[PDB]
Design a protein around this ligand. Structure first.
Ligand SMILES: Nc1ncnc2c1ncn2[C@@H]1O[C@H](COP(=O)(O)OP(=O)(O)OP(=O)(O)O)[C@@H](O)[C@H]1O
Ligand SMILES: Nc1ncnc2c1ncn2[C@@H]1O[C@H](COP(=O)(O)OP(=O)(O)OP(=O)(O)O)[C@@H](O)[C@H]1O
Ligand SMILES: Nc1ncnc2c1ncn2[C@@H]1O[C@H](COP(=O)(O)OP(=O)(O)OP(=O)(O)O)[C@@H](O)[C@H]1O
Lengths: 321, 428, 395
């Protein structure tokens, strides 16, 4: 249910060259700082492009994040905000009420003796986002379910004779305090959210918190330069349902050259690593940017930005550890 | 007429000392515990930053100490004083579950609700003893229940949300049987990090030898036995319990402390300096949650003195309490360094004679340890040259010891000053 | 009936005469100790403790709604085959209300579905109410039993919740549990916590913690062998002891001012002893030691039939309690050496490593004249450096 006026508004908004930074700022206005994390969340929200080959195998187009860091960095608020901006979403907190279900279950209603086949939260969030908090506290059964869903994207139910396989194609955004290793390997971008003691940053953060507490009465005050949540929802839905981009030949050449150089340098350093999986992750990030700008081809600048994001998140996480 | 009496009490500026003395009259010492309990009882004003966030007005307190250090007495007093109080425990023996849960009725095969301790204490004071021992379900649900103050359930179509907004005042025992000052607070307590992080005021009750307090406590216990047969440390009037209850009820009905008067610059500077010390030393860093706790304690003080506006004195008191707790939670060397660095804020509204008493206690400890090291046994009377005390007072820029000698606290601790010999003599 | 004179009216004239004779006995303590446990040889302190437990203390209740303990508990730890179970056996023989177990104990709520009533079968603790509950093999109890015992010792109640039936049952009794040290050999080097496998609160609630050692004394071995052979080959009768015990329990002595001051002085002395680092104590003292001392003084006053506590009773109780606690040069001088280092660090900025050590030699030598002591000080400094060099740790 979108009027032509809203479609015209979306076209005008996407036509701007600064749409990427605007979307980055629009995410979580209350939380101060962490621009790179906001950009990564934007990339996750817009998502990659799904493909199908003649053999019948389908390459997935989802992007998965993971936020590790010290407590008190407002991960939960960010996850809740993300859950309210995707067209489809769900919030499950680890080990709390078994983190919702996360597993398709077959219970038996005792009075009626019938068998009911509720799907897990992942099934309910097909084609959307699944925000998980306290990832390390997950129950073992839900850990198995997560391991299965992130690999094959098909949740299977085999209990009490009933044997079916459901479908779950969701982008997983999880946050944990500290370090299962296989699942951490499945994730595309791993952000280690550290802390800084810049006096200006600390003073600004303290002032912002104090001002929020002071203006609790003045909560009606608005923000400028951002996008309303409903507008963001509609824009995300429209971009997802209209434009699926692809790489260009020059971008492919640049990415291949960068990958070859990176692998040669990594091998030389080990003599004193990046694998194809991370190359595909970079491809999906580039496609997500291209889809965000409503274009049928991703240029070289998208590849450069994806490389920068990957270097900031995954390479830095590997180096720090 | 009762309202006029409450207003007249509000007229007296020095009422905080009165009410602090009133808290737990049977309990001797532990003035930090009494201050924290009074702040918790008076409560802070809650706010709602829209639907996105909610600011709770509770002031939780955690009491980790040593065996035989009067921990349960405080809980009993708070139960007897504060209305809508629920006493529980975590060890077991028909202990009430902390958090509610939906367990299907076994006989009738119907999904049912079983309320927890938190739900039964809504808009009241919840009390827990032996908080270290808990069920795994409770251990995992306490964090979220204290965070959101509401328990939400969804099982087979039963979507019920229970409101649990209560002030938690817990107690526990440390790992190993004694509190080791060399280790941090988290290592001493067998509790996960988030659970400790949820509590605002952390209080440590260590066990040390104080012969004067030992004798006074022995007198108190023996006299209690005699009374049941078949002393103002603050030195200020003690409010009646009933009038105190009326004042507390007034402070929760006809007052709303506003935060218009604030100095964000000093708060920001304090936050930056404390974070500098914490990050440089490598200890536990101060987060925004400590700032929120400070704000809540400031509003609690503003309600405590029945002011619609937060005077900067209340802000300084809140900063003092927060710094004291946070510093005491560190390691011994880290705590010493942080006390050395931050001394102006920690000294707000502190008696000079009190600091002189601390110096005297230090000197007496030195002499006692020397006597036990050399003579093996001790001596009935202790004499130390006054010149060391004068020098240390000059270090803290203090003088006029004669006024301190004339103080009643000097006499109560059995101190005598010999002007001829320049010696301070203490008898046991 | 609770009035002593009322039961005396129930009692016959000869019974009252015997009771008066027992009350006027000067050596009533020794006679009761000998008669209560005739077969066992030696270990008089444990016999005295058990007798004081049998007499008990005066209960009180505060105006605040709380209740004060009026019972004392004794736990015996000793080497195998040291006749520790014999104590429990004789206590059960003497006491008609004693309930012997071997580590069910609390209650059994069996619902009579025929009448739809939750009839509860009393456990060991319930049957031993207002008396003595002897629990052998105290260290073999399961975690549930340990929790139940701690709850009984802390709140003198028994809480049960079976089939959705929550109930609280009162239980006021004294425990005479006995257990063996871990491994069967008591290491005097280790403290009571290491020797005995028990949870900390349960260990803390106990009083009069007596410890038994074989000691392999040849004379005692000869006496034991002769006693065994004679077995193969009492001043007051048990009935008289029971009558006198009931008469004494009907009394209720109260503390006096002089006894109060003496109690305060003795508590100060005991706390100073514990705080002293001359010999490490097997268990740190608290206010619970003072409460136990008060209970023991009340028990002594009951036994001597006096209606008020007197300083002699406090003297006896303090002697017994002091003998109950077992205490487990280089460190002595090292403490004052650290004191001097710390004081000089605060007072004076200069702080050298080895030159200050040479100065501390004479500093500690200010009252002694021995060069061998000086080389020993150098060796101690070397060992300390092997461990630490005035590190930021406390004490
Ligand atoms: N810009 C900010 N940076 C850091 N903390 C912030 C910021 N703005 C607000 N906060 C506060 O920081 C706290 C962090 O809350 P939240 O539970 O979301 O994070 P967390 O402690 O990292 O989470 P978790 O314990 O679940 O890992 C909240 O009290 C929030 O109000
Ligand atoms: N100011 C005081 N300091 C120390 N002890 C006190 C003080 N006031 C009273 N007491 C007495 O000290 C004793 C300590 O027993 P209490 O029940 O309070 O211990 P607790 O702190 O609950 O112990 P635990 O950690 O084992 O649960 C009591 O008899 C109490 O009356
Ligand atoms: N003074 C004495 N000390 C120890 N044993 C004595 C003494 N006098 C007599 N005995 C006899 O020596 C034996 C002591 O061993 P006993 O079987 O009573 O040990 P126990 O306490 O039951 O040991 P455990 O519980 O460790 O197995 C008994 O037969 C007892 O009658």
């Amino acid at each position: 249910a979108i009027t032509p006026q809203e479609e015209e508004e979306f076209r005008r908004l996407a036509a701007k060259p600064d749409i990427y930074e605007t979307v980055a700022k629009s995410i979580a206005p209350s939380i101060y700082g962490s621009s790179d994390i906001k950009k990564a969340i934007a990339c996750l929200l817009f998502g990659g492009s799904r493909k199908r080959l003649p053999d019948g195998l389908t390459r997935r187009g989802d992007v998965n994040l993971l936020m590790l860091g010290d407590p008190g960095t407002a991960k939960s608020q960010l996850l809740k905000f993300v859950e309210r901006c995707s067209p489809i979403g769900v919030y499950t907190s680890g080990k709390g009420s078994s983190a919702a279900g996360l597993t398709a279950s077959v219970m038996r209603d005792p009075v009626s003796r019938n068998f009911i086949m509720e799907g897990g939260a992942m099934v309910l969030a097909d084609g959307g986002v699944v925000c998980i908090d306290e990832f390390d506290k997950m129950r073992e059964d839900d850990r198995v379910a997560i391991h299965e869903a992130m690999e094959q994207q098909t949740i299977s139910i085999a209990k009490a004779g009933i044997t079916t396989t459901l479908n779950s194609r969701c982008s997983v955004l999880a946050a944990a305090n500290s370090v299962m290793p296989t699942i951490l390997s499945r994730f595309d971008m791993i952000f280690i959210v550290k802390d800084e003691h810049n006096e200006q940053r600390d003073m600004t953060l303290a002032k912002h918190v104090m001002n929020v507490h002071l203006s609790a009465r003045t909560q009606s005050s608005s923000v400028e330069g951002e996008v309303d949540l409903n507008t963001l929802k509609k824009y995300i839905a429209y971009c997802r349902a209209k434009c699926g981009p692809r790489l260009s030949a020059e971008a492919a050449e640049k990415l291949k050259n960068r990958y070859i150089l990176m692998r040669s340098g990594a091998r030389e350093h080990e003599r004193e690593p990046i694998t194809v999986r991370q190359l595909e992750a970079i491809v999906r990030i580039s496609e997500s940017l291209g889809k965000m700008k409503l274009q049928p081809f991703a240029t070289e600048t998208d590849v450069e930005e994806a490389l920068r994001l990957f270097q900031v998140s995954t390479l830095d996480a590997a180096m720090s550890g | 007429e009762d309202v006029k009496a409450i207003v007249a009490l509000s007229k007296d500026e020095r009422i905080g000392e009165r009410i602090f003395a009133s808290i737990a009259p049977s309990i001797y010492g532990h003035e930090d515990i009494k201050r924290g309990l009074a702040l918790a009882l008076f409560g802070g004003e809650a706010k709602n930053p829209g639907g996105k966030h909610k600011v709770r007005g509770d002031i939780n307190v955690l009491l980790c100490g040593d065996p035989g250090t009067a921990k349960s007495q405080f809980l009993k007093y708070v139960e007897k004083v504060a209305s809508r109080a629920v006493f529980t425990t975590g060890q077991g023996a028909s202990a009430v579950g902390l958090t509610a849960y939906v367990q299907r009725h076994p006989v009738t095969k119907e999904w049912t609700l079983e309320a927890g301790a938190l739900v039964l204490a809504d808009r009241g004071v919840c009390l827990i003893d032996e908080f270290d021992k808990m069920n795994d379900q409770d251990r995992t649900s306490i964090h979220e229940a204290m965070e959101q103050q509401s328990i939400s359930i969804s099982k087979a179509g039963i979507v019920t949300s229970l409101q649990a907004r209560c002030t938690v005042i817990a107690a526990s025992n440390p790992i190993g049987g004694r509190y080791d000052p060399s280790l941090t607070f988290s290592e001493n307590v067998d509790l996960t990090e988030p659970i400790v992080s949820r509590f605002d005021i952390l209080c440590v009750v260590r066990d040390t030898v104080d012969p004067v307090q030992d004798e006074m406590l022995a007198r108190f216990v023996v006299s209690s036995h005699i009374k049941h047969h078949p002393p103002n440390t603050f030195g200020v009037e003690a409010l009646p319990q009933e009038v105190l209850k009326k004042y507390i009820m007034y402070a929760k009905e006809k007052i709303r402390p506003k935060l218009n008067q604030m100095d964000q610059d000093k708060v920001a500077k304090m936050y930056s300096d404390l974070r500098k010390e914490s990050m440089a030393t490598g200890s536990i860093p101060i987060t925004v949650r400590h700032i929120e706790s400070m704000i809540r304690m400031a509003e609690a003080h503003a309600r405590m003195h029945l002011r619609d506006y937060v005077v900067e004195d209340d802000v300084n008191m809140a900063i003092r309490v927060m710094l004291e707790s946070f510093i005491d939670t560190q390691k011994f060397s880290v705590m010493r360094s942080m006390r050395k660095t931050f001394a102006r804020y920690l000294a707000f509204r502190r008696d000079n004679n009190e600091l002189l008493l601390f110096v005297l206690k230090q000197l007496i400890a030195e002499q006692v340890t020397y006597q036990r090291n050399r003579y093996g046994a001790q001596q009935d009377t202790i004499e130390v040259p006054e010149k060391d005390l004068v020098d240390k007072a000059r270090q803290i820029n203090i003088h006029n010891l004669s006024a301190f000698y004339d103080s009643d606290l000097f006499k109560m601790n059995k101190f005598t000053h010999d002007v001829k010999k320049k010696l301070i003599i203490q008898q046991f | 009936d609770q009035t002593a004179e009322s039961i005396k009216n129930q009692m016959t004239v000869q019974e009252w005469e015997k009771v008066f004779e027992m009350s006027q006995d000067k050596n009533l303590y020794h006679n009761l100790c000998t008669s209560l446990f005739p077969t066992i040889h030696g270990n008089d302190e444990i016999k005295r403790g058990v007798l004081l437990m049998l007499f008990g203390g005066v209960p009180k209740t505060t105006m605040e709604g709380t209740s004060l303990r009026g019972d004392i508990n004794v736990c015996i730890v000793g080497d195998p085959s040291t006749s520790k179970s014999q104590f429990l056996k004789h206590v059960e023989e003497f006491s008609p209300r004693a309930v012997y177990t071997s580590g069910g104990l609390t209650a059994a709520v069996v619902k009579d579905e025929e009448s739809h009533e939750f009839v509860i079968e009393a456990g060991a603790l319930m049957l031993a109410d207002n008396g003595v509950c002897c629990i052998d093999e105290f260290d073999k109890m399961d975690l549930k039993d340990q929790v139940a015992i701690h709850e009984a010792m802390e709140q003198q109640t028994i809480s049960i919740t079976k089939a959705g039936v929550k109930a609280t049952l009162n239980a006021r009794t004294s425990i005479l549990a006995a257990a063996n040290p871990v491994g069967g050999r008591y290491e005097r080097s280790k403290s009571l916590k290491h020797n005995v496998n028990l949870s900390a609160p349960i260990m803390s609630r106990f009083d009069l913690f007596f410890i038994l050692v074989d000691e392999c004394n040849e004379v005692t071995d000869y006496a034991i062998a002769r006693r065994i052979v004679d077995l193969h080959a009492r001043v007051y009768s048990i009935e008289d002891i029971q009558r006198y015990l009931l008469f004494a329990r009907q009394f209720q002595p109260k503390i006096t001012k002089e006894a109060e001051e003496f109690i305060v002085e003795q508590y100060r002395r005991l706390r100073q002893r514990d705080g002293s680092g001359v010999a490490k104590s097997s268990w740190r003292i608290t206010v619970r030691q003072l409460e136990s001392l008060i209970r023991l003084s009340e028990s002594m006053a009951r036994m001597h039939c006096s209606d008020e506590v007197q300083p002699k009773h406090v003297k006896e109780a303090f002697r017994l309690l002091s003998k109950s606690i077992i205490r487990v040069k280089q460190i002595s001088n090292l403490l004052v050496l650290y004191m001097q280092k710390m004081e000089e660090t605060e007072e004076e900025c200069h702080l050298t490593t080895t030159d200050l050590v040479n100065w501390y030699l004479k500093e500690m030598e200010a009252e002694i004249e021995t060069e061998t002591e000086l080389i020993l000080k150098k060796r101690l400094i070397e060992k300390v450096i092997h461990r630490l060099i005035y590190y930021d740790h406390i004490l």
